[PDB]
Write a protein that binds this ligand. Structure first.
Ligand SMILES: O=P(O)(O)OCCNS(=O)(=O)c1ccc(OC(F)(F)F)cc1
Ligand SMILES: *Cc1c(COP(=O)(O)O)cnc(C)c1O
Ligand SMILES: N[C@@H](Cc1c[nH]c2ccccc12)C(=O)O
Ligand SMILES: [Cl-]
Ligand SMILES: [Cl-]
Ligand SMILES: [Cs+]
Ligand SMILES: [Cs+]
Ligand SMILES: [Cs+]
Ligand SMILES: [Cs+]
Lengths: 268, 393
């Protein structure tokens, strides 16, 4: 399919940036997670980044560590995640869906089989957090064989060789890291360096989404102004879940308010 | 792109977030440079000799083997400053940190021995040391935690995931992914992403080099086999390295069998796990059917980790080294036997290696064999554990 390409073309036609929330699948349970995700979409999410709970999420800060723990407390498994993904796609045909994976969950039972299952349920992209471009060959090859975009990470101080590799190897969108470190709303990244954004465009990279530490509407606006196609926010979204565990109705209302505000910031 | 091969056959690699690749490349370059630098080598050798007490003895153990055709020597890493082999490689890694201009050290620890080793090297060499330790391990290792604090290290409990060693490993990498510009990650074993399996081997290889010189001096020939316990793989690869090209010399690694392989309560991924990708490496690991990283178990905390260094997986795959397991009860018997017959209190980790050598002897007592066990550490730390278990019996 061409869900990211179609989205970016539509957004470009509206002179508009993408707002893309991250949540952990099955946090804090399967049924509530499904309701959360429908809320994110209704409030104006342009695409989703969805985490499969993993025992050892070494690119995540405490907020998302805790999301993983909550999902495990609910007994959430990768198979259940794939069931959820099929249902999400069945409800929402066009929204791009990206997974945030750790390598062992993609590898352990067969790389090709993993990407085939992604294709079957209608996932659009897979970002494997602990597979750098240097180790990416079998992952990106399997992704492309199954019409899945492999997402690569452009660190803020990427050299020319890395930019060329990320531009060549990636599809769907290019992940532009706001800073070093791990996920977390408590640590704000930098503005996208004009040089990176421009170099990525020079090398015909997939459109850039800025992520890490994006927690306010102003940051979304700033990312788009700098020439990124949009912004990803995770910890800020997950914090609303964490804050409202005992109040599922309020949780949805707060997620709606937040996503609406973040999406509004992306409009020209 | 790298200067050295990150793989041992299919095993190893650099499975870290993109943000950490410059840190690994920087470390590899500094290592390659250091290895060619006579001044670095001389500094390292001086610390090993005058601070750590190398060379360590090679002790012939006659009482244990009486009435058999086994001749057994123990390589006495228990006599190294700090009481375990870990001191060798922490001194080398501290010197690399300084070479790169780093002022801070991060380390993971489970049993606490690596934490103590990192702390002592950091105290000596003027580095600010922080140590990640799973909260469950903190609770179990008050003595080591106190030692680390006495040596000026900051000990940071890790409450995420299973609150044990693998979780401390994750947290160390999380920290480094934000702090690499100023901090060096002093990984505690011959595992994790390249270049750590290579660096740790090279900074432990004096174990095997000395053993070779000492056995040639005393016996006029190489051992029939060298035997070492395998937690993450450092003491074993340090013993094995200099013998790899001596094709006649058996290399035997001993994984912890815990309560028994059949119970699933063990730490023997090389022979009983499945290849996965975790902690920056492709290696055999204990994992659930779905690929979550599993809980390992051993009586000995030093061996209690669900994976193993990639060079061991490779040496196994090509048949150059053989790997076996030893249960808690076998290790306990070896511990008691060494105390009573040789007056040496071995680490329960090392007791796994000794137990296997005792088995080799006892199973075939008229087989002529010259064996070296790497006695990776002393067992003062284990006396209450052994006391408490033997309180029942
Ligand atoms: O808003 P924050 O700071 O919580 O960031 C949320 C990011 N969520 S994500 O799935 O895009 C994401 C993307 C990349 C990650 O690691 C990697 F760069 F190493 F690959 C981890 C998570
Ligand atoms: C830590 C430790 C081990 C296990 O670690 P390896 O890296 O496998 O050597 C073995 N023996 C002792 C005494 C230890 O302290
Ligand atoms: N748990 C032991 C040995 C160790 C340190 N880091 C490790 C990583 C993997 C396996 C074992 C280890 C210690 O802390 O002293
Ligand atoms: Cl010498
Ligand atoms: Cl048994
Ligand atoms: Cs705007
Ligand atoms: Cs000595
Ligand atoms: Cs003998
Ligand atoms: Cs192990």
């Amino acid at each position: 399919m061409e869900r990211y390409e179609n989205l970016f073309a539509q957004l470009n036609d509206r002179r508009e940036g993408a707002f893309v929330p991250f949540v952990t699948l099955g946090d804090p349970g399967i049924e509530q997670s499904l309701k959360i995700i429908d809320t994110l979409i209704d409030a104006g999410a342009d695409a989703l980044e969805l985490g499969v709970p993993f025992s050892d999420p070494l690119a995540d800060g405490p907020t998302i560590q805790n999301a993983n723990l909550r999902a495990f407390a609910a007994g959430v498994t990768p198979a259940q995640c794939f069931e959820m993904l099929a249902l999400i796609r069945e409800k929402h045909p066009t929204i791009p869906i990206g997974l945030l994976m750790y390598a062992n969950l993609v590898f352990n039972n067969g790389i090709d089989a993993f990407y085939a299952r992604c294709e079957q349920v209608g996932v659009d992209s897979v970002l494997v957090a602990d597979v750098p471009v240097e180790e990416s060959a079998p992952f990106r090859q399997a992704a492309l064989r199954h019409n899945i975009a492999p997402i690569f990470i452009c660190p803020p101080n990427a050299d020319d060789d890395l930019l060329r590799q990320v531009a060549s190897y990636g599809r769907g969108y290019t992940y532009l890291l706001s800073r070093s470190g791990v996920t977390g709303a408590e640590n704000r990244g930098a503005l996208p360096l004009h040089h990176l954004i421009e170099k990525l465009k020079e090398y015909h990279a997939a459109p850039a989404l800025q992520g890490f530490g994006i927690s306010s509407p102003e940051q979304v606006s700033a990312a788009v102004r700098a020439g990124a196609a949009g912004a990803i926010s995770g910890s800020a979204i997950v914090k609303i879940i964490e804050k409202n565990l005992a109040s599922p109705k309020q949780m949805l209302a707060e997620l709606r308010s937040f996503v609406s505000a973040m999406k509004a910031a992306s409009r020209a | 792109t790298t200067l050295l091969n990150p793989y041992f056959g299919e095993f190893g690699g650099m499975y870290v977030p993109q943000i950490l690749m410059p840190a690994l490349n920087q470390l590899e370059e500094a290592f390659v440079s250091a290895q060619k630098d006579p001044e670095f080598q001389a500094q390292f050798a001086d610390l090993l000799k005058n601070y750590a007490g190398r060379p360590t003895a090679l002790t012939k153990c006659q009482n244990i083997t009486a009435g058999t055709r086994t001749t057994l020597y123990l390589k006495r890493e228990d006599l190294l400053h700090g009481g375990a082999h870990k001191t060798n490689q922490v001194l080398g890694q501290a010197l690399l940190a300084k070479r790169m201009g780093k002022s801070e050290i991060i380390a993971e620890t489970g049993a606490g021995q690596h934490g103590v080793a990192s702390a002592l090297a950091s105290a000596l060499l003027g580095l600010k040391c922080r140590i990640y330790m799973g909260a469950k391990d903190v609770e179990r290792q008050s003595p080591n935690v106190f030692r680390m604090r006495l040596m000026g290290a900051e000990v940071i409990p890790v409450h995420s995931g299973s609150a044990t060693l693998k979780d401390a490993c994750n947290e160390a990498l999380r920290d480094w992914s934000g702090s690499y510009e100023t901090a060096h990650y002093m990984l505690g074993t011959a595992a994790g992403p390249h270049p750590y399996p290579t660096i740790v081997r090279e900074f432990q290889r004096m174990i095997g080099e000395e053993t070779k010189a000492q056995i040639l001096d005393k016996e006029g020939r190489l051992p029939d086999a060298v035997i070492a316990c395998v937690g993450g793989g450092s003491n074993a690869i340090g013993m094995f390295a200099d013998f790899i090209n001596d094709t006649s010399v058996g290399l035997i690694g001993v994984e912890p069998g815990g309560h028994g392989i059949e119970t699933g309560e063990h730490g023997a991924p090389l022979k009983h796990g499945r290849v996965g990708i975790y902690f920056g490496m492709k290696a055999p690991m204990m994992q659930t059917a779905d690929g979550q990283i599993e809980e390992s178990y051993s009586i000995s905390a030093g061996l209690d980790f669900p994976s193993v260094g990639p060079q061991h997986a490779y040496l196994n795959s090509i048949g150059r080294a053989d790997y076996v397991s030893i249960t808690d009860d076998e290790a306990l018997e070896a511990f008691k036997t060494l105390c009573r017959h040789e007056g040496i209190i071995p680490a329960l980790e090392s007791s796994h290696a000794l137990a296997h050598a005792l088995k080799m002897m006892r199973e075939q007592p008229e087989k002529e064999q010259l064996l070296v066990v790497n006695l990776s550490g002393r067992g003062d730390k284990d006396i209450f554990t052994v006391h408490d278990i033997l309180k029942a019996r």
